[PDB]
Amino acid sequence: ADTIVAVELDTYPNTDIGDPSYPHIGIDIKSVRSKKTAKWNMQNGKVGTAHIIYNSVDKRLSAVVSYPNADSATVSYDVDLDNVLPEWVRVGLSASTGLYKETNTILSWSFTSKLKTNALHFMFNQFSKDQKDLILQGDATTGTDGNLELTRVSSPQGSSVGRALFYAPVHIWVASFEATFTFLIKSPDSHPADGIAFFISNIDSSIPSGSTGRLLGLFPDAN
Amino acid sequence: ADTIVAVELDTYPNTDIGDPSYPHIGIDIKSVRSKKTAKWNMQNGKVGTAHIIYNSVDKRLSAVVSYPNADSATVSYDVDLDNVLPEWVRVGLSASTGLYKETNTILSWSFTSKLTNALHFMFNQFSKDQKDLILQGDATTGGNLELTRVSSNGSPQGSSVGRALFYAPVHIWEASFEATFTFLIKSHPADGIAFFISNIDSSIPSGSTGRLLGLFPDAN
Ligand SMILES: CCN(CC)c1ccc2c(c1)Oc1cc(N(CC)CC)ccc1C2c1ccccc1C(=O)OCCOCCOCCn1cc(CO[C@H]2O[C@H](CO)[C@@H](O)[C@H](O)[C@H]2O)nn1
Ligand SMILES: CCN(CC)c1ccc2c(c1)Oc1cc(N(CC)CC)ccc1C2c1ccccc1C(=O)OCCOCCOCCn1cc(CO[C@H]2O[C@H](CO)[C@@H](O)[C@H](O)[C@H]2O)nn1
Ligand SMILES: [Ca+2]
Ligand SMILES: [Ca+2]
Ligand SMILES: [Ca+2]
Ligand SMILES: [Mn+2]
Ligand SMILES: [Mn+2]
């Protein structure tokens, strides 16, 4: 199986697999069952921003999600990436839908990593119809209104999964990275599902079979 | 396979499986490859003390090892016990030797856990038939607990593994705990002593002498 470190923006509580009873953001280390979560007052139809940061000095992964004019949701956790991830990885964005659904629209994505010094930076503020520096998996598509649609849209569809990975491998392991993305999750359902994640993976990571819904396109099961 | 959280006092560097290049203390969460380590200035033949603490407020596992009039060695790490361990556990001490060897002698051992429901035990002496301990492998009692095999002349043996678990199951989440032990390692020494928390049915995995400390079935 693939090795995954991720930050999830989990819009749909699946309390049967350990997710708190409310929308939450969490840090996922080799399992969909987050090591730590924070309540997320998710806003249907508004543009939100997510910011992820890591350094090898304190070796803590930290994330914050926000909308303009509202309090943000943060979470942080100890993790030594040398133990969890291979030395070279692939960075990406993942999303899914299940029974319930929502748009998983990405309007912008930036990433910076330094390994001290060698560095990689990319910034997307728009996405073209053939964005050759992204590897699109599953249902993900680019270029409709200049955005990245991680899951299928006609209006959002159910039982969809998709992801977009930066084309180049990244040398992940002082060592550090940051990622930022903007997203629009809209849904006609009064329950949106399921969510978006920023992830870091083995270079040859692919969508696990049966990873729609509560598995976010990241994991082959809920273990 | 068992589920293990442990504090290791690692006397022998196995750099081929990620242990730093010096004796160290480490926090192990479901792998012998420590999540975090600190350098440990181990003192051959001198009684040492280890203290381990955990609370569900900050959900951090901490540990300190020291000797009289020396600097201590300390390590801490975020651990959410609910998503690592089963709800009921046993607690114990484990040790091993390999191609290099040491005595792994425990002179006292205490433990406290609160959830209020509470459990506490304190051993400042061990008897020959210590009915509230489960002895696994080469471990023996009777006033000390000898985790690994010591011959009749008092010299340790290689290729040995042994554990002692408290007799009752322990309710570890539904939260805090503390453990202390004192030990005497005499010998290059190998391999170390751990305090661990396990599934209730845990037993020494086959082939877990040497670097695997009696805890883990492989070095994954
Ligand atoms: C009353 C509780 N709720 C409302 C939230 C509920 C909803 C749907 C079912 C529910 C229950 O129960 C079953 C049970 C089964 N069984 C087999 C005959 C008995 C277990 C078959 C299908 C469904 C279904 C079902 C019916 C029609 C079409 C599909 C299904 C269908 O998808 O159901 C999945 C199996 O649900 C079993 C019970 O799960 C707990 C309640 N529940 C169900 C769902 C819907 O989950 C699906 O969507 C989620 C959000 O997008 C994803 O996170 C998730 O990965 C995904 O499988 N959530 N909460
Ligand atoms: C730390 C220094 N290093 C790395 C360069 C090292 C490397 C090889 C040996 C080393 C030491 O020490 C011995 C000692 C012995 N003795 C006689 C039984 C004791 C003096 C025999 C073989 C070896 C060998 C040896 C030479 C050739 C072929 C095989 C081996 C040899 O050690 O074979 C056992 C399997 O080893 C594969 C190589 O492992 C990586 C390096 N390293 C360190 C050690 C000693 O390990 C053994 O003891 C440890 C301490 O109790 C245990 O933690 C551990 O589980 C255990 O396997 N092994 N290797
Ligand atoms: Ca969920
Ligand atoms: Ca090309
Ligand atoms: Ca070792
Ligand atoms: Mn979740
Ligand atoms: Mn070690």
Side-chain angles (χ1 to χ4, degrees):
Chain A
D2 302 334
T3 303
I4 301 295
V5 167
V7 173
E8 62 171 58
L9 289 54
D10 181 352
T11 57
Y12 185 81
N14 299 98
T15 60
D16 47 313
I17 58 155
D19 281 344
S21 49
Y22 38 79
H24 53 287
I25 62 172
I27 293 169
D28 300 347
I29 308 294
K30 303 176 41 60
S31 169
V32 83
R33 300 179 188 245
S34 313
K35 298 301 170 217
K36 186 175 176 90
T37 68
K39 184 175 162 71
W40 177 33
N41 295 306
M42 179 271 287
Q43 295 184 231
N44 187 326
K46 197 173 277 187
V47 183
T49 303
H51 195 46
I52 299 102
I53 84 108
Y54 181 79
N55 72 82
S56 76
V57 182
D58 56 5
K59 296 185 232 278
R60 282 176 65 84
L61 183 57
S62 314
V64 59
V65 181
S66 66
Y67 307 88
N69 302 321
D71 292 321
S72 57
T74 306
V75 67
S76 287
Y77 213 72
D78 291 328
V79 63
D80 198 341
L81 291 176
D82 313 332
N83 285 301
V84 172
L85 281 169
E87 172 167 10
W88 288 91
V89 295
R90 272 235 154 77
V91 302
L93 298 176
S94 195
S96 60
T97 62
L99 174 56
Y100 302 125
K101 71 205 85 77
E102 67 198 25
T103 57
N104 301 114
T105 304
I106 308 282
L107 286 91
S108 75
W109 179 29
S110 71
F111 176 84
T112 301
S113 169
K114 295 170 218 267
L115 175 71
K116 146 185 256 290
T117 302
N118 285 11
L120 173 72
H121 170 71
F122 60 83
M123 172 167 71
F124 302 97
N125 285 302
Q126 52 158 220
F127 298 90
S128 75
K129 307 218 68 152
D130 186 21
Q131 196 62 54
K132 293 196 185 294
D133 56 355
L134 289 179
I135 304 158
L136 296 180
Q137 300 184 328
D139 291 342
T141 63
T142 54
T144 310
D145 271 350
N147 296 327
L148 165 58
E149 292 292 7
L150 293 168
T151 48
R152 191 174 299 266
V153 151
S154 52
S155 310
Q157 306 298 300
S159 305
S160 185
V161 61
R163 333 190 302 182
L165 291 88
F166 188 63
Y167 194 118
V170 181
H171 204 182
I172 215 70
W173 75 252
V174 67
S176 74
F177 69 85
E178 68 171 292
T180 306
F181 65 91
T182 60
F183 58 92
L184 178 47
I185 295 173
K186 306 162 80 133
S187 170
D189 305 336
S190 75
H191 284 333
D194 284 83
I196 304 178
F198 168 80
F199 73 99
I200 307 162
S201 68
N202 49 302
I203 64 169
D204 59 324
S205 179
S206 52
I207 293 164
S209 60
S211 65
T212 63
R214 73 198 177 176
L215 300 180
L216 302 168
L218 298 183
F219 291 106
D221 63 46
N223 289 172
Chain B
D2 294 347
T3 301
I4 300 298
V5 164
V7 174
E8 57 169 61
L9 287 49
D10 194 333
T11 58
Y12 181 88
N14 303 272
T15 58
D16 61 305
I17 64 154
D19 282 347
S21 267
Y22 33 84
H24 50 284
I25 61 165
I27 287 171
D28 299 353
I29 308 294
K30 296 190 291 213
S31 170
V32 79
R33 301 177 181 248
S34 300
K35 297 319 194 219
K36 190 168 182 168
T37 63
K39 181 165 188 161
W40 170 35
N41 298 126
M42 186 262 160
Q43 299 193 41
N44 199 5
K46 183 166 207 209
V47 184
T49 304
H51 187 62
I52 298 108
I53 61 181
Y54 181 76
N55 80 63
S56 74
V57 176
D58 52 30
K59 295 198 160 206
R60 277 173 74 69
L61 181 66
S62 302
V64 64
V65 178
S66 56
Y67 301 92
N69 308 121
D71 287 347
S72 69
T74 293
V75 66
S76 292
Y77 213 72
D78 288 329
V79 194
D80 208 352
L81 297 182
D82 58 296
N83 63 41
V84 166
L85 291 160
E87 173 167 15
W88 285 91
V89 296
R90 277 191 165 89
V91 307
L93 303 173
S94 193
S96 66
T97 62
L99 302 188
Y100 293 95
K101 56 265 185 174
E102 68 202 27
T103 63
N104 288 121
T105 306
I106 305 293
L107 295 72
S108 66
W109 181 25
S110 73
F111 176 84
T112 302
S113 162
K114 311 197 180 194
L115 237 192
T116 292
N117 292 6
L119 174 66
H120 165 74
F121 63 81
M122 170 164 65
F123 298 111
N124 286 306
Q125 194 161 254
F126 300 91
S127 47
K128 195 78 66 188
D129 177 36
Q130 189 66 53
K131 301 195 180 296
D132 54 4
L133 285 178
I134 299 166
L135 299 182
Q136 294 177 342
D138 287 342
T140 62
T141 51
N144 294 332
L145 160 63
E146 295 279 22
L147 294 164
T148 54
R149 192 71 63 201
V150 182
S151 306
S152 56
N153 75 357
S155 64
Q157 293 181 200
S159 303
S160 183
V161 61
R163 320 196 304 183
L165 291 80
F166 185 68
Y167 201 100
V170 179
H171 198 184
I172 213 65
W173 62 258
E174 206 175 64
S176 67
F177 64 82
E178 307 175 341
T180 303
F181 65 92
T182 61
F183 56 95
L184 179 57
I185 298 167
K186 73 212 176 154
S187 178
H188 296 65
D191 278 86
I193 300 177
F195 170 82
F196 71 98
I197 306 174
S198 68
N199 53 299
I200 60 184
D201 62 304
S202 178
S203 57
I204 296 166
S206 176
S208 62
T209 64
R211 72 194 184 176
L212 296 180
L213 297 168
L215 299 171
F216 295 105
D218 58 52
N220 287 165

